Amino acid sequence: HMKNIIITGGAGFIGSHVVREFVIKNPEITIINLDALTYAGNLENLKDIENFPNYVFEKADITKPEELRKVFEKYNPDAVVHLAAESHVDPNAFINTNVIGTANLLNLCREFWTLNPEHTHGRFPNEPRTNLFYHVSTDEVYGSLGETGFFLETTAYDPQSPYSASKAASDHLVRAYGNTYGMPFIVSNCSNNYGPNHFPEKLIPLCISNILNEKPLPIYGDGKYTRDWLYVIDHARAIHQIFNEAKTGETYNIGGFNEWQNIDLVKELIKQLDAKLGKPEGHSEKLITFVKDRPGHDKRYAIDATKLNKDLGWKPSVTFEEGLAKTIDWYLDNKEWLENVTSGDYQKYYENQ
Amino acid sequence: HHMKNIIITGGAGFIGSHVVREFVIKNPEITIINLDALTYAGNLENLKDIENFPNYVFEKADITKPEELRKVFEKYNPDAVVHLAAESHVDRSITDPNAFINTNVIGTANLLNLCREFWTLNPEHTHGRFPNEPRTNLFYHVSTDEVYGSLGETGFFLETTAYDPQSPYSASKAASDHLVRAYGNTYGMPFIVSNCSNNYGPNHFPEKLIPLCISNILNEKPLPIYGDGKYTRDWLYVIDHARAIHQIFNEAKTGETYNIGGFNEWQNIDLVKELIKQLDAKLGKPEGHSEKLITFVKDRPGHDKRYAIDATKLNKDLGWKPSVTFEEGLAKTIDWYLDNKEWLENVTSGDYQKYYENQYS
Ligand SMILES: NC(=O)c1ccc[n+]([C@@H]2O[C@H](COP(=O)([O-])OP(=O)(O)OC[C@H]3O[C@@H](n4cnc5c(N)ncnc54)[C@H](O)[C@@H]3O)[C@@H](O)[C@H]2O)c1
Ligand SMILES: NC(=O)c1ccc[n+]([C@@H]2O[C@H](COP(=O)([O-])OP(=O)(O)OC[C@H]3O[C@@H](n4cnc5c(N)ncnc54)[C@H](O)[C@@H]3O)[C@@H](O)[C@H]2O)c1
Numbered sequence A: 001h002m003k004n005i006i007i008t009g010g011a012g013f014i015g016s017h018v019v020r021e022f023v024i025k026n027p028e029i030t031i032i033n034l035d036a037l038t039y040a041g042n043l044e045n046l047k048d049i050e051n052f053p054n055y056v057f058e059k060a061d062i063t064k065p066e067e068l069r070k071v072f073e074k075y076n077p078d079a080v081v082h083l084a085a086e087s088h089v090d091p092n093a094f095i096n097t098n099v100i101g102t103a104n105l106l107n108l109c110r111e112f113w114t115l116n117p118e119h120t121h122g123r124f125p126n127e128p129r130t131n132l133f134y135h136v137s138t139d140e141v142y143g144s145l146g147e148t149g150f151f152l153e154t155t156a157y158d159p160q161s162p163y164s165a166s167k168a169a170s171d172h173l174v175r176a177y178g179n180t181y182g183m184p185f186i187v188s189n190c191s192n193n194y195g196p197n198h199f200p201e202k203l204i205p206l207c208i209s210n211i212l213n214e215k216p217l218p219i220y221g222d223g224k225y226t227r228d229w230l231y232v233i234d235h236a237r238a239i240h241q242i243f244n245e246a247k248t249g250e251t252y253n254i255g256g257f258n259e260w261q262n263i264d265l266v267k268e269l270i271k272q273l274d275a276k277l278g279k280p281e282g283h284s285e286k287l288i289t290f291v292k293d294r295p296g297h298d299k300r301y302a303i304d305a306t307k308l309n310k311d312l313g314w315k316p317s318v319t320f321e322e323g324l325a326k327t328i329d330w331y332l333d334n335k336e337w338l339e340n341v342t343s344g345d346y347q348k349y350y351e352n353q
Numbered sequence B: 001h002h003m004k005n006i007i008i009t010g011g012a013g014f015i016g017s018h019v020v021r022e023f024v025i026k027n028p029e030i031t032i033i034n035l036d037a038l039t040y041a042g043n044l045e046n047l048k049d050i051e052n053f054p055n056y057v058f059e060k061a062d063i064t065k066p067e068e069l070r071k072v073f074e075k076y077n078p079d080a081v082v083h084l085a086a087e088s089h090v091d092r093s094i095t096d097p098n099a100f101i102n103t104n105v106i107g108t109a110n111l112l113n114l115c116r117e118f119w120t121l122n123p124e125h126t127h128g129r130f131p132n133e134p135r136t137n138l139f140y141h142v143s144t145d146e147v148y149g150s151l152g153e154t155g156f157f158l159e160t161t162a163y164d165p166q167s168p169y170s171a172s173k174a175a176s177d178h179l180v181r182a183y184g185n186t187y188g189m190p191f192i193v194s195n196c197s198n199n200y201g202p203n204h205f206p207e208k209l210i211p212l213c214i215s216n217i218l219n220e221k222p223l224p225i226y227g228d229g230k231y232t233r234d235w236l237y238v239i240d241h242a243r244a245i246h247q248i249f250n251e252a253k254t255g256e257t258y259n260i261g262g263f264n265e266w267q268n269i270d271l272v273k274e275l276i277k278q279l280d281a282k283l284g285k286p287e288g289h290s291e292k293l294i295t296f297v298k299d300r301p302g303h304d305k306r307y308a309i310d311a312t313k314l315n316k317d318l319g320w321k322p323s324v325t326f327e328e329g330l331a332k333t334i335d336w337y338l339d340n341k342e343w344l345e346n347v348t349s350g351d352y353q354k355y356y357e358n359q360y361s
């Protein structure tokens, strides 16, 4: 049985929800939140569980092997759930964190875990797991879609941005260390997340803000850019379930079983926010502002997560409309959190507390 | 627009030296800059034949050191890069465990970053909108068929085969492929990627599989065969690879990927038996003389794998085909080996590493 589990990037958006899921569901396991607290981390995300007996925070940078080694020595971790990553494109910082950072963690897992030479080359035992490297990644490793089709676990990688190339690289390292050294691993690739603790500059929170403040809602081209949207709480639940139930070495796609054009997303937020505030039907549609089309905005990103449901029974707990309702409710209930991010005060949390 | 300066990274290496030579001979009007850090893998003796050519220049530079690369870009304002520099000795030293990522991934990014800064990229060419016009710039990325994983009894690697790298090395190479394509898509950087089979031929280091088998046959040392020797590779003659790179560089549509193979697939046992046959015949030995050296040993995991390219696309698009069968390429390789025991001795003694200090001082 596992006694210590590291969650990297646990101060972030998705990571805080995963930290919460593991802490709540596993009181007999120490959950180590390992995080460098970049601009993207927000320890205010975990104010509710920060005084739990099985939660511990460690400020550390996965590009610094010496700092990671100190955490590995301190806790002797049985497993890593790896969410730490950089999306801002020191022009190679994102490669340092996403690729070298993943290798640094893998090297320490290879060093601290006792790997069996008999399990290399896909020969993972059906026996229960003692260790696991759980790698969280993005559906952008698969590239983009035309009008038909979906991302499957068998879809050829075709990352189209520097960020998604660096994430695709980290996926490859995990799988190659699994094959070459017998390191137990899982990889999951998920669609765009949304929900509580999303930073206010992100798409959905920004649209909520622009609607409440009667600011224009820019629509590029015809707004036909299309994404599957996954509720962050559903994502964290899937990671936990897969971590516990999936066969070693599997890949699962995780998504919300939908696909939405941006114009329809904006129109749904307008619909819910006008009704929420008792405004007339269609009140905020005058905010929609059609602008020029971005090159490649005519792209489609739609994950197929049917393998995950077929194997483990996981399914989303909300439709996108229901998830937006909870997201709007959370937004309107957390004026302070939102303002602490916008003001930059959120970063003083580690020093102040 | 006629290019004037082309960088070949890793041009002191095995494949890179042959690529330098092909570009030097075929393009007398273009300056070919051999950019190489001279690791243990590099050997400037490889280029002794062309080191005084008027369109050849050597620049000792490390692609993991942006300041050294920037100096080369400032000096030559290069129009193109043919990128072969790479590191494959994973676990070489605990003093540098991620050297393979630093060279293969970060080093590729460092080169991509300078191309993005020095080249004029048209924002209308992003998202795969490259024009059907002669290129002014090209990032030609050389990679490995191992990005595709391995094969069962049937099937071949295609350009459309999903990446499945199975080693830290091939994962780092796959990562570099992704960076090249993403810079192409995101910034409109002209690029080509090719992934090739195992290379063999002149200037191959003596510990590599085919040179070691030649040495062991010549010196009546055992030839270990793992399991049944059914490990199978497509084998590409190194000079055919360099010729393909040069042709693709000039004729392929911007943004294309090609797999380059030798139009064959050989089991290790058949490769060893072919070397035995040719070496025995070349040195006047009775047929079967060296077969007693074959030594069957315990099979090891991953030694029954199969790696083979279907190069239909390259053959259809450009008309390219190998200049030799594997048997003919082995004959040329044996001939070169026997004519170059000086080169081989200089590698084994370590003296090859003193060439730069001895000739460029
Ligand atoms: N829509 C999405 O957000 C989305 C979609 C698909 C996949 N993913 C993946 O999910 C993971 C989490 O994404 P997110 O949106 O929650 O990220 P985020 O930006 O909200 O949080 C990342 C966290 O990692 C930390 N971090 C950054 N660099 C670090 C380093 N060098 N060392 C240690 N910690 C470091 C940051 O401080 C932050 O707390 C990432 O791996 C991302 O690729 C996210
Ligand atoms: N069978 C094969 O050799 C084979 C097969 C498939 C693909 N490839 C690819 O072909 C390319 C060349 O392979 P090779 O066998 O000729 O390699 P090699 O090991 O013979 O040569 C590599 C060269 O790169 C140089 N180099 C290494 N690190 C460097 C750095 N940081 N900065 C600058 N120069 C550096 C070395 O000094 C050397 O001259 C590689 O990209 C490899 O992935 C090779």
Ligand SMILES: [Cl-]
Binding pocket: A218, A219, A220, A221, A222, A223, A224, A225, A262, A263
């Ligand atoms: Cl839009």
Ligand SMILES: [Cl-]
Binding pocket: B224, B225, B226, B227, B229, B230, B231, B268, B269
């Ligand atoms: Cl063998």
Ligand SMILES: [Mg+2]
Binding pocket: A304, A306, A307
């Ligand atoms: Mg299905």
